[PDB]
Amino acid sequence: GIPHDHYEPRTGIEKWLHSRLPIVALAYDTIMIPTPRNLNWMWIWGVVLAFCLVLQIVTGIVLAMHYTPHVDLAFASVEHIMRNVNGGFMLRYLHANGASLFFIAVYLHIFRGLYYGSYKAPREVTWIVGMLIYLAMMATAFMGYVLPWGQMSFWGATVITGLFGAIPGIGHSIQTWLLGGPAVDNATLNRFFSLHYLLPFVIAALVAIHIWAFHSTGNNNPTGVEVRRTSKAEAQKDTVPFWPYFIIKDVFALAVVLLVFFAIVGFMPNYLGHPDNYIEANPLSTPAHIVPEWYFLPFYAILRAFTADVWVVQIANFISFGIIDAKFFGVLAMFGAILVMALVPWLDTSPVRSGRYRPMFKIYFWLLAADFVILTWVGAQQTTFPYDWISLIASAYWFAYFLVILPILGAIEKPVAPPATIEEDFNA
Amino acid sequence: GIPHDHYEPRTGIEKWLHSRLPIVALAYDTIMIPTPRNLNWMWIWGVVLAFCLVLQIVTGIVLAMHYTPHVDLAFASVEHIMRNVNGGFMLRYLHANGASLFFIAVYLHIFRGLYYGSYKAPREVTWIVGMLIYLAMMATAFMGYVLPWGQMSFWGATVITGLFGAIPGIGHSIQTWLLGGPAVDNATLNRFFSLHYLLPFVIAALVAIHIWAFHSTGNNNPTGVEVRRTSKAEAQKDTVPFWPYFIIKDVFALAVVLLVFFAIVGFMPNYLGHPDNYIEANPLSTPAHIVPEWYFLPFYAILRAFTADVWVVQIANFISFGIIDAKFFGVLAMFGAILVMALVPWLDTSPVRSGRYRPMFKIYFWLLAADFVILTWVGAQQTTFPYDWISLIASAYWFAYFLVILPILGAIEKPVAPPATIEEDFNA
Amino acid sequence: GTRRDFLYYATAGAGAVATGAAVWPLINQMNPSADVQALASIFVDVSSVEPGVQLTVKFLGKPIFIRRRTEADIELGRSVQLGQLVDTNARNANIDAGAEATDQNRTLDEAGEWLVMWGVCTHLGCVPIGGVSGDFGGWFCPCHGSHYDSAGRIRKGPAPENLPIPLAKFIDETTIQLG
Amino acid sequence: GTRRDFLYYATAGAGAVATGAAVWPLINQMNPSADVQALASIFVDVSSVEPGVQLTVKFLGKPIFIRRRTEADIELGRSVQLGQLVDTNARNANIDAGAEATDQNRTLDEAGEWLVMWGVCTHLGCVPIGGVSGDFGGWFCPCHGSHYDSAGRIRKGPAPENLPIPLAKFIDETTIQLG
Amino acid sequence: AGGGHVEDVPFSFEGPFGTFDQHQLQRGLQVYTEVCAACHGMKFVPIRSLSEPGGPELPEDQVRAYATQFTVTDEETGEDREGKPTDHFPHSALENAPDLSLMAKARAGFHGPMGTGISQLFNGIGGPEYIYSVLTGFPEEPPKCAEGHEPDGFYYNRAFQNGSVPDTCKDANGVKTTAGSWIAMPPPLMDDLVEYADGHDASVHAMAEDVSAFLMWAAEPKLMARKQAGFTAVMFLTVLSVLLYLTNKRLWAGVK
Amino acid sequence: AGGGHVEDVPFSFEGPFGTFDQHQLQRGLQVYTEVCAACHGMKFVPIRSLSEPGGPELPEDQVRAYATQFTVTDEETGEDREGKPTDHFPHSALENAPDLSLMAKARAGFHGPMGTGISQLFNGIGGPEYIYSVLTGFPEEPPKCAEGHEPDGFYYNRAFQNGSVPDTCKDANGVKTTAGSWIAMPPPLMDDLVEYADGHDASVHAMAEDVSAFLMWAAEPKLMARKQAGFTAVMFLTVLSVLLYLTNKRLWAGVK
């Protein structure tokens, strides 16, 4: 809703088309939105995510032309791709490593929002739509990893459908419904294939609302000071048109990301993988060194941190008359960790949007960034001492940050004055 | 661009959301568009098509959860659906017969447009997007029919991939590329499955543009006289809001269509099918009574009408130094029949929009409708006398209508005066 | 009036039913198809199993452990008092549902030699590693670190229950019937 | 200037290459994979074939017809003049590419008893029906109504060419090697 | 080949309210096992479906006993064993004997008129009627036109239309004179070849009609379930259409 | 179990410019055929790939001759025949001998430090290094802690980490003291067990390194093609990033 100039048809074909379908007008108003001039390199992760979604889709459809969703043929058909399909090995490594790139980008994307207050009013809808997208990504990536039907595929599917068995009363029904039987078998693989195909299209639809959402409010910027809308004169001092200024910056940044990404795929495509998924699914043996996908490790670490010996768990079990045991508590803790992050617009009670001008907030934020890395690292360690405590301390801080620090900080902190306008910060 | 009232938030929740994401404003302005009051029952087929697209998609995703794209397992997995999946027999018959309903609706939808001039300016874009949807529909339905891997599946795939082999020079490359080998085999089945899933989402995207197209211009009506736009006062005498007046009318008509459709699915689900597709694919034997899906018959009749004996083929072959033989001529004739229909906005030179007030046009239009039924019928007959002549005369008239009659008619016909306004027609 | 409003209720009520009749079959198709067996029955030959050997057998798509326990395994299991256990229920399909998780109620025979149980971690279904693993001389689940003892009882970790014991009985001297 | 426009050229030129390098493998992955055999070799036992019998054999995923022609079949084939044929080329991989479609050039032997050809309609690939079908005492294709004669030559319909004859030869008295 | 005339049998399962006769399907099952199974298989029919509602509905113990007679290669073991209800019927023992799982749906007995499909619209597709006609259409003497010209290993059948025919049985235009043609199936039935337990007559008529009903169920086991759903949907939508009609009328009333 | 120490072999194929040694892969194939194949299969490797570029690249006639030694069950016939290049290598003859098609990728030899993955980042995953260590890590005498406590049918290996270990080889917390553990594979190699045609030395060192390279190729046959693509993509994108950097710079000049 910033003041800006509108489209005008010039060619005879444009005048002809615009009076019938203003599709060029729609592309113009999208690509020429006045965007704050002072955006830094942390605003590129949206395009990286956009590229990933297309990459996964284009490699996905291609991979689905050679893959067989049957327990007897799935694993072999992926090796058929690697060995026999023209360029199949490269298309496979691109799809697989593309998922990692997809997840590197959201975590950087998410923490960008958490630092600069891109979730605070008027941007709640953008954030919530983002959270729905995030759940869809996890569900998609989970089901994709099951399709090769390796050892990690099979037992990850056993465990993750098992999450739903922890709901009191209805848990066993949901699990059977997801599995299509008493255990992970062909019915499970077959339905995961259909749903792995569907959800990327749902994400694309959600991304459309996502773009519409922050186009309606206007992009946040590093200062947290909104663009002046009282006149076109002062809107222009805060902004530059999205095209060409930020298109070229996106294409440039994207080329640098792909330079690294293609070096990984070309020269170390298996670094981010688990060697055990090159072993055929064995329903009778779980590998000793079973570990989740790296982008799942933080939430995995939280769940398994809550054992029967944990103090807060024993209180929960007693107060809840046994309903909340360590098993279900860990599931609540894991989905609760994502939910409190979804609720961050209503838990951060500070009126200062950008954390750049919040001295105490910076400390606890960088602890959260460090904590998220700790959780990822501990996810790959054994459950013996001291890692068991490290995952408990890390889990405790995650919930404390959203549920205690952020509400308290907004009613105690003495923030620094932000700039008067976006123009002031850019010139500095 | 018709004058109308806009959305206004009333509840506190609506005021909150509208200032962040005007999604309610978009749904309101869509569902309350003033629509001509005098629409008859031929304007319902858009919703029927809409229902079909959802029905096919929802049953399709569900069917793909139990179907296996492998030549050794494809036919068996459908019988597994029919016999073992809860309600699987019903979901399959809904998906299969749902394709026929999908095609019954476009032909009525299309011929509606040809009669009332819904393709004429300013609605060319609406018409062309429709034509793109129509090509996508045919490609989607063809590939779906291949998935059971019956006898009709296999030989239909052989023939239709053979169409591309008829292109001089590049034909065999396209054919090998489509097949993934020397013959219709697993590589062909596997890739047709991936694309059968994809294209319905492209259709959904095209339908979104389709709706945007006729929302920009406003719906045509039986008189061909546009809604008055000089003031809101006189637009209401020509229109009623889409909601509730035409929503309820659509829901009513839809309930009646489904009454018939569900009677078919419940009591004669195989009438519109070919019994030979309940026979497993045999690459060594083509059934004697091989026949295309009924909704493909008119274009099939046109293609096979152009044999070596046809004199225009003999002229084409001689003049073209042998490039255009009966084989390639028949392929050109078939896709050319669809193309001239796509070009009807630029072939119909009459300034009168609605055919209701074009006395000579009505005659040639109803001959075209009869011709389309005749073409459908001869497609199912043998190629012996007299059917060989019936199909040649019928093909000739199809091209004559678009390429000869319509250009000539617009410079000869004496049309009747249409009503001054929509209001006049409604009261009558 | 009263006859006028009745149409708007009856129509809406019919519309509500139509949605429900369409949604249930879209859910129920994902429920187990007719080809899926819920329960079945099989027989396992055991004459070749010396003490200290675990036989792992597939049953309903999941592992079943048949271990002929050593002297040490049996002694350790019986030395544990009920109050020291995470789960004090026997979880044994072959006896009463309220039976206690004593080592005697966890084996098929009176001598306590034959431990037959689902090799399915009660946390989230992974297969615990046997061969005397973990901190309690039993099984270790590598997925989230549950430790089971020599009678298959949960002692440490997130898992809430002892490994379940299926319906199992010796049909003759050397053959166990599961189911 | 001269170098200002050059940057915009190198950038646009690089973008064109990058698209091409990404689009080609997305197309080429659909071309035949390595597991596909383009050509192979096989042997067919024929001692069981009486005159008037067609043997139908699978080769490279397509049907091959082996008919031992009767006296009527051979005479009819030799009575047709070249100018009455739609396609006057023999379509025979075993002899010169320009050879004429005489009945002698359509059979493996000089007596013209053994007709070996691809059972793949040259129109759009369906399998023509044999057993002396059609209007020319040969084969009839039910897909769009092509008629072939007793030497497998196209005579009527949309099909442009005679049924192709693969590389085929008698390896001994009773065995034909195709390929 | 082409289409032909089939005998219009009144099967119980025909008509919108038509249903299978449970005892008939069991008699037809006996015929298949004792006669057809020597050559024909049903590779898509799970044996356990003989217990499912809407079919023969045999007790699960009888079906368990029935499955034993088959020798199945176990998938895990790879060694042979007795059949279970979870196994499918075997493949065709005779290589050129077609599989009968879907025969009653893979054949149409009613065609035309003049290729308008009106015949199927009123009389049904006619698959089980066709099967009946083939089982019925074996005459003891062949047609006079082939007196001593029968291909060896083939048999004349009145209803079979896709078989070869001697040159002496074609007209001047090469079209066959006989109602049917020569089939590779020898006449499988004969009076009282099967001893039905319930004492039902076992004439070729009864066995041909009984086995056709069984083969209709093997092809469409969910036929009865499909019709119940059809009735429900039609009654729902009839009421709903009426309510929507009155609703649509009372709405547009304030316009005209 | 856990991770352990592997011997850092300098394989030719490591590094961005690393490539397979054609003669080494052929020697490794002979070792696989003459030694490992007795127990291990490669069920995912088409035999024809021995001719493909980027591998051993044997002439297609040699590969055709090589395929004959295998007895394959034809899919249609079901009867045995000699192997073709279009057939895969056989399954493992020994039921508990794992398939080696993907072994060089299904094992990691480098771990840590402290689970930070930095070791793999610089040395690679280390599968063929791991294989080499297992073939090499068979000592003639076992560790002192189990002198007379060895499980029967198992053998001590320095590098194998997933095996059982006697009670006398565990510390006070039950963690094993020994560098490795007991593997069910008896020592397969021994000096000059294989006679290389070109006279290359066939010490356990040489065969273990040669067959590890062959087994790396069997798992990643397209390794060389992948790196060429990596090099190409990086060179394209290096130029493109530089050009896009200059473009981005000259554009934003008219703002600040």
Ligand code: HEC
């Ligand atoms: C039977 C006499 C064998 C011969 C000859 C070879 N291998 Fe083997 N191997 C065999 C068995 C029974 C096992 C299972 C080991 C266990 O403890 O269960 C193995 C295992 C391997 C492995 C896997 C090690 C692991 O981490 O599980 C490898 C990498 C391996 N063997 C390599 C290998 C090679 C290269 C051989 C030829 C030189 C070879 N083995 C021969 C049985 C037998």
Ligand code: HEM
């Ligand atoms: C495939 C997934 C996603 C895509 C394509 C995407 C795309 C984008 C783009 C292009 C922007 C503009 C600013 C920028 O580029 O940095 C943006 C901003 C944003 N995104 Fe996302 N995003 C995705 C996922 C998410 C997720 C998972 C979340 C939160 C949980 C989220 C929340 C936000 C927020 C809060 C903003 C700031 C908007 C503003 O500047 O006002 N996004 N996103």
Ligand code: HEM
């Ligand atoms: C858009 C987001 C997507 C994500 C995050 C994603 C993620 C994944 C992941 C992580 C795997 C495991 C790869 C492996 O280890 O082998 C996978 C597998 C697979 N995915 Fe996707 N995917 C996406 C889109 C798609 C789409 C749209 C399709 C199909 C149309 C698809 C088809 C496949 C196939 C066939 C496999 C198995 C073969 C393989 O990748 O190795 N993917 N997916």
Ligand code: HEM
């Ligand atoms: C515009 C949308 C669609 C059209 C026109 C269409 C058309 C068809 C047709 C005509 C068949 C053959 C049915 C038969 O003869 O048995 C078919 C089969 C099939 N379709 Fe679709 N379909 C559509 C959408 C979808 C989607 C979105 C999916 C999957 C995600 C899907 C999955 C399948 C499957 C699995 C089969 C084979 C199983 C069967 O035969 O029922 N369809 N489709």
Ligand code: HEM
């Ligand atoms: C899945 C396929 C389609 C869907 C869902 C769809 C949907 C619709 C709907 C809802 C309408 C408004 C209601 C009506 O006029 O009946 C409409 C109008 C129209 N459609 Fe389609 N349509 C489809 C295919 C096509 C095709 C294949 C063509 C032409 C070749 C076409 C051309 C038109 C035209 C000319 C109009 C008139 C709109 C106006 O009067 O401005 N549509 N369509």
Ligand SMILES: C/C=C(C)/C=C/C=C/[C@H](OC)[C@@H](C)[C@@H](OC)[C@@H](C)CCc1oc2c(O)c(OC)cc(OC)c2c(=O)c1C
């Ligand atoms: C039809 C679709 C269905 C059923 C969708 C369900 C989606 C559920 C959730 O997504 C929203 C889920 C993906 C998400 O939970 C927040 C993850 C972070 C869960 C992380 C997770 O992963 C594991 C994993 O990957 C493994 O791999 C080998 C193994 C595992 O055990 C050792 C786990 C595991 O113990 C956990 C907690």
Ligand SMILES: C/C=C(C)/C=C/C=C/[C@H](OC)[C@@H](C)[C@@H](OC)[C@@H](C)CCc1oc2c(O)c(OC)cc(OC)c2c(=O)c1C
């Ligand atoms: C990867 C996907 C690919 C290559 C898709 C290509 C789609 C192309 C066209 O759609 C746009 C195509 C479906 C459309 O042509 C305009 C149809 C009207 C073609 C009609 C058609 O059908 C047949 C058929 O169905 C058969 O069944 C058993 C058998 C057939 O022979 C006897 C035919 C046939 O002879 C023709 C002309």
Ligand code: FES
């Ligand atoms: S699955 Fe066994 S501990 Fe979590």
Ligand code: FES
């Ligand atoms: S394919 Fe034989 S004529 Fe059309």
Ligand SMILES: [Sr+2]
């Ligand atoms: Sr304690």
Ligand SMILES: [Sr+2]
């Ligand atoms: Sr009847």
Ligand SMILES: [Sr+2]
């Ligand atoms: Sr190294």
